[PDB]
Amino acid sequence: TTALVCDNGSGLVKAGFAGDDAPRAVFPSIVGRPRHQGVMVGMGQKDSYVGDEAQSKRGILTLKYPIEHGIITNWDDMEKIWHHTFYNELRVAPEEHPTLLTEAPLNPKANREKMTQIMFETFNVPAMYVAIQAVLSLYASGRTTGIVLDSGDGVTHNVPIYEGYALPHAIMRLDLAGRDLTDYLM
């Protein structure tokens, strides 16, 4: 049974299988809703759009980001993100696949609680694990020690690890990343 990796980042959801080099699905974490008078009848009008479909039709959609600064605020949009990334992007059954999920350090614990509860009840799995992104970045570097500066779209955090031992008193999180740079460029 192949395990699943699903980095639910603030900007871009990146999901795929173990033992693979490139991520199978990389798509932005947006849920769109229509904001205009639907005048045409039929033709497959949806109540919501997830992912690249919301990116294509973005002229007539209010786009919502369910993750801000690493914290999942809206949860049914997050469930729609997970249902899309399980059943459309990857086209797999979550009932037969363990799932590793990523998380920023110094997160609220209730995010982990509700992530565990939804991921064990709505999309019920054999098993699950929540990791830290910088440790996986040090894994991809292939080395032992060092300080990892991981900077996504919401979270920029430094994690120092020496000889496979993290130092939790020296984790430095800052909520300044690419979305703030996008707002500043605006």
Binding site: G19, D20, D21, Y139, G142, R143, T144, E163, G164
Partner: peptide, 21 residues
């Protein structure tokens, strides 16, 4: 005493996972 004297690895694991992909 005369009778006694007459008697006398992060690196290997991570590179393994890299080559597994």
């Amino acid at each position: 005493r005369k009778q006694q004297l007459a008697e006398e690895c992060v690196i290997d694991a991570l590179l393994a996972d890299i080559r597994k992909g």
